[PDB]
Amino acid sequence: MANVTYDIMWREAMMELLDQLEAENPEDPALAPKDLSEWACIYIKYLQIMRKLETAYDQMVHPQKRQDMRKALEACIGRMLEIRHWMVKLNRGLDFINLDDILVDLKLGPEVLEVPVPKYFIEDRAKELDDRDKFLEALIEKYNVKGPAASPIIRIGAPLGEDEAILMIQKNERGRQARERARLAAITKRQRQIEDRRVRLGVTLSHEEAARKIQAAIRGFLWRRRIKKEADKELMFIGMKPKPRD
């Protein structure tokens, strides 16, 4: 976006924080948030506030603007942590709170519940964490320590003996060849039966008839390909297939 637009959304974050404060302590105490519905809407509001403040603090090129944003982002995140802990206390101790109904009512998605990870938790310490990892790896190579275990694999078992493997491969291959011989014999028998039927009927397959059958099959195959491609295009047009990304 435009840098002036990002400054505008930072200003909007400031007004949203002010409005959240005012809603928390309105001039009418009866309008103050009393139930979990209002407090959870307020919590979602701080969630989006900290989301966009976090994005802004990431993306601004202005040093002093980001320095001012750092306090706002830290304070908003800490406030949201306070709100989360307090709502868990008021939710009979359940650390997990269900907001799908409220999100649907307010026209928001479950992705809002996914609290983003601030990037400045790592980016600001790039060189320092680089040196720390360098020290870790230097100590690792000095002391010859083994890292975490890799992804586990089905322990199929130790390989069988050489002679036993030879024997069972021999039976397996004889069985496979027997099946192949049976399939070939079946195909040959079908061919012989069809040719004998044609001979008995007195119908010999001429070149013209063979060409007609082959061209019908080719037309069917090519038309199937074209139908599948046009159906794919209709899928991606009316919304049934993802178009191949360019």
């Binding site: 800490g78 949201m80 997990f96 709170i97 609290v115």
Partner: peptide, 16 residues
């Protein structure tokens, strides 16, 4: 609880 809720709760409790 959904694993999305689990990630949200763990983030708010520890990471933030």
């Amino acid at each position: 609880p959904s694993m999305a809720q689990v990630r949200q709760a763990l983030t708010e409790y520890a990471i933030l």
